[PDB]
Homo-oligomer: A and B are copies of this chain.
């Protein structure tokens, strides 16, 4: 058997950041993710704008930004917001979700049982189960499939799409508001790629290719690529993901049973919300 300090279930932004924070504070951590489709972290750009996250309180952002700048590096980007300019914090999403410091098993967690020395995680098709003292369940919108709670009763999914163009760079990165609580954001996510999203947040059963095409046109029109059929040519990739939401939430970080944590509910401002949860977990586990 595998016996470690911490097992993190889920390797999206929340499970990645929480595990690496624990590993970089000295703990032995192992991750498990079944790479299921629809994960909300795949389309993420990891943009963190003060205006979007200030509702948290200085008690929460600066703890988060220090963790991210220390562990990953927070680069600041200035976006064209109208004629004025606004600065947005950024972590490279490929850097967070690609970091390999914490080993990650590509298995599906089937059960979570407590033992004398702590918790035991069961995996489909494996009579063996992993074991650790502390377990973090950061399974996004699927967290209510492994952990139960009152807060976990409000867990719902709000899906969205982002588009990444290859071999392209924007001379001006922008945030263009088009509706209440909705803004089209375009920027260079890589030195060779452009990411655009309009903030659409819809229940996955109400999402469809036609509603996705409306968001493609809004995003494509904003970088003047509408009309060229870039999707069918393989020049743009459409990125779909389900964001976890629990009304009445920055996110849900609750010790459901002694030693078993649930981390989900990050909705829109997730990278910053994950840093807080990681700061709090390294504070409460170390």
Contacts and interface: CB of A to CB of B under 8 A. Distances in A.
A11 to B, nearest CB: 21
A217 interface: no
Interface string A244-261: 000000000000000000
A167 interface: no
A87 B145 contact: no
A117 interface: no
Nearest to A87: B205
A76 B205 contact: yes
Interface residues of A, number: 15
A66 B145 contact: yes
Interface string A198-234: 0000000111111100000000000000000000000
A78 B208 CA distance: 6
A85 interface: yes
Contact of A78 (B50, B76, B87, B210): B210
6 contacts: A78-B208, A78-B209, A78-B210, A85-B211, A87-B206, A89-B205
